[PDB]
Design an enzyme around this catalytic site. Sequence first.
Site, PDB file in Angstrom:
ATOM      1  N   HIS B  43       0.793  -1.210   0.000  1.00  0.00           N
ATOM      2  CA  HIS B  43       0.000   0.000   0.000  1.00  0.00           C
ATOM      3  C   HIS B  43       0.851   1.299   0.000  1.00  0.00           C
ATOM      4  O   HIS B  43       0.347   2.379  -0.325  1.00  0.00           O
ATOM      5  CB  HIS B  43      -1.093   0.010   1.076  1.00  0.00           C
ATOM      6  CG  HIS B  43      -0.557   0.397   2.429  1.00  0.00           C
ATOM      7  ND1 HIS B  43      -0.201  -0.557   3.360  1.00  0.00           N
ATOM      8  CD2 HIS B  43      -0.323   1.642   2.982  1.00  0.00           C
ATOM      9  CE1 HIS B  43       0.211   0.085   4.461  1.00  0.00           C
ATOM     10  NE2 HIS B  43       0.174   1.403   4.263  1.00  0.00           N
ATOM     11  N   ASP B  99      -0.533  -7.534   2.175  1.00  0.00           N
ATOM     12  CA  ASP B  99       0.041  -6.200   1.973  1.00  0.00           C
ATOM     13  C   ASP B  99       1.594  -6.279   2.054  1.00  0.00           C
ATOM     14  O   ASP B  99       2.208  -6.104   3.122  1.00  0.00           O
ATOM     15  CB  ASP B  99      -0.549  -5.250   3.027  1.00  0.00           C
ATOM     16  CG  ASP B  99      -0.187  -3.792   2.862  1.00  0.00           C
ATOM     17  OD1 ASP B  99       0.274  -3.393   1.763  1.00  0.00           O
ATOM     18  OD2 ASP B  99      -0.326  -3.077   3.859  1.00  0.00           O
ATOM     19  N   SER B 199       4.003   3.252   8.308  1.00  0.00           N
ATOM     20  CA  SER B 199       3.574   2.162   7.388  1.00  0.00           C
ATOM     21  C   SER B 199       4.737   1.530   6.645  1.00  0.00           C
ATOM     22  O   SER B 199       5.665   2.205   6.241  1.00  0.00           O
ATOM     23  CB  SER B 199       2.521   2.676   6.344  1.00  0.00           C
ATOM     24  OG  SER B 199       1.259   2.100   6.554  1.00  0.00           O
TER      25      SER B 199
HETATM   26  C1  LIG Z   1      -9.269   7.053  11.039  1.00  0.00           C
HETATM   27  C2  LIG Z   1      -8.258   6.317  10.136  1.00  0.00           C
HETATM   28  O1  LIG Z   1      -8.825   5.116   9.641  1.00  0.00           O
HETATM   29  C3  LIG Z   1      -8.562   4.368   8.571  1.00  0.00           C
HETATM   30  O2  LIG Z   1      -9.006   4.526   7.453  1.00  0.00           O
HETATM   31  N1  LIG Z   1      -7.680   3.332   8.646  1.00  0.00           N
HETATM   32  C4  LIG Z   1      -7.465   2.504   7.480  1.00  0.00           C
HETATM   33  C5  LIG Z   1      -8.243   1.199   7.670  1.00  0.00           C
HETATM   34  C6  LIG Z   1      -8.322   0.374   6.424  1.00  0.00           C
HETATM   35  C7  LIG Z   1      -7.730  -0.882   6.414  1.00  0.00           C
HETATM   36  C8  LIG Z   1      -7.819  -1.695   5.289  1.00  0.00           C
HETATM   37  C9  LIG Z   1      -8.500  -1.253   4.156  1.00  0.00           C
HETATM   38  C10 LIG Z   1      -9.092   0.012   4.149  1.00  0.00           C
HETATM   39  C11 LIG Z   1      -9.001   0.818   5.284  1.00  0.00           C
HETATM   40  C12 LIG Z   1      -5.969   2.230   7.256  1.00  0.00           C
HETATM   41  O3  LIG Z   1      -5.236   1.873   8.169  1.00  0.00           O
HETATM   42  N2  LIG Z   1      -5.535   2.277   6.028  1.00  0.00           N
HETATM   43  C13 LIG Z   1      -6.260   2.683   4.832  1.00  0.00           C
HETATM   44  C14 LIG Z   1      -5.305   2.481   3.663  1.00  0.00           C
HETATM   45  C15 LIG Z   1      -3.942   2.128   4.257  1.00  0.00           C
HETATM   46  C16 LIG Z   1      -4.144   1.929   5.759  1.00  0.00           C
HETATM   47  C17 LIG Z   1      -3.154   2.820   6.561  1.00  0.00           C
HETATM   48  O4  LIG Z   1      -3.401   3.989   6.696  1.00  0.00           O
HETATM   49  N3  LIG Z   1      -1.930   2.287   6.897  1.00  0.00           N
HETATM   50  N4  LIG Z   1      -1.113   2.844   7.851  1.00  0.00           N
HETATM   51  C18 LIG Z   1      -1.342   2.331   9.187  1.00  0.00           C
HETATM   52  C19 LIG Z   1      -0.754   3.126  10.329  1.00  0.00           C
HETATM   53  C20 LIG Z   1      -1.793   3.336  11.402  1.00  0.00           C
HETATM   54  C21 LIG Z   1      -1.252   3.233  12.773  1.00  0.00           C
HETATM   55  N5  LIG Z   1      -2.294   3.129  13.733  1.00  0.00           N
END
Ligand SMILES: CCOC(=O)N[C@H](Cc1ccccc1)C(=O)N1CCC[C@H]1C(=O)NNCCCCN
Lengths: 10, 253, 36
Positions: B43, B99, B199
């Site tokens: 991602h 991922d 990430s």
């Molecule tokens: C208020 C923030 O919420 C989210 O969207 N989180 C998403 C949840 C999600 C998971 C799978 C599919 C779609 C959405 C997320 O972590 N995402 C959305 C896309 C990438 C990933 C992220 O930001 N990844 N980084 C994670 C670091 C967080 C530490 N606590």
Amino acid sequence: DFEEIPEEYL
Amino acid sequence: IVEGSDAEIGMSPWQVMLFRKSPQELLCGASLISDRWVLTAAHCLLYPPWDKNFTENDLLVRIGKHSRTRYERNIEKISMLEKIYIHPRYNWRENLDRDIALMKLKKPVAFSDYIHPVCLPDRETAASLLQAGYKGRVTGWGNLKETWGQPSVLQVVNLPIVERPVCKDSTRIRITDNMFCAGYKPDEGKRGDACEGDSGGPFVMKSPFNNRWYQMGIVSWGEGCDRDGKYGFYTHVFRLKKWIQKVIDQFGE
Amino acid sequence: TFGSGEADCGLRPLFEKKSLEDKTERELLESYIDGR
Ligand SMILES: CCOC(=O)N[C@H](Cc1ccccc1)C(=O)N1CCC[C@H]1C(=O)NNCCCCN
Ligand SMILES: *[C@@H]1O[C@H](CO)[C@@H](O)[C@H](O)C1NC(C)=O
């Protein structure tokens, strides 16, 4: 906020 | 990293910074698995819902860093990417399943006191260490808070692995066998988590058998940062080892 | 590069190689229900 990196790298 | 602390110099010599060429910015964390291969989260490179689709020529890999923003003369090494490989079954449409991604360096980096690769788990190492209650370690230059600052130096935090059922009951996202969760329970009176900018970084463990550090997970997803009753989700490196081997063997190493 | 990672893998120059411990590694080891 990032300090400038050498141009050889760009 | 939320609720961590400054890392010691040379503490995570496999820690890699994924760096955008222009604008110049921190994209994600990553890890050095050999002199020519970098491991990160798919991602970080490809995420169509956000119009994200990075290419070799868009990025830079910075290895051996401590300072977040400074150009660490005579310490850090900057490398160019030869090829990016994303898991053919990465599921960006639904839940980030699988991922994972590999990056082959344009040229081998030389090891030093600040630059050294981490080990990939073996079946028995995974079996022994990947247990609820066992702590692992996460590192990165990501935010210090969900909505704050930003660290000056690399941050570190130790987190416990969590029971699958507790992980599943904490979210509405569909969890797979290619993931695991970690973090303290609201109860535990100890916090911490990865956050934006972290990430793609490593979740590691130290074997009590042979003293080596192993990368068990990759920072994948989480709902906010350090929220009570929420956890961090990580890619299950071991479950994907065969794809890793396959790529490294069919394409270089 | 692969299985079990590398060859010299997971052994830090400034730490394991010199027999020094980092400030919080003990924490991990103690959770594995006390290390080696
Ligand atoms: C208020 C923030 O919420 C989210 O969207 N989180 C998403 C949840 C999600 C998971 C799978 C599919 C779609 C959405 C997320 O972590 N995402 C959305 C896309 C990438 C990933 C992220 O930001 N990844 N980084 C994670 C670091 C967080 C530490 N606590
Ligand atoms: C990313 O960008 C590529 C070429 O540089 C593609 O060919 C590819 O299809 C891609 N991602 C898509 C939009 O999901």
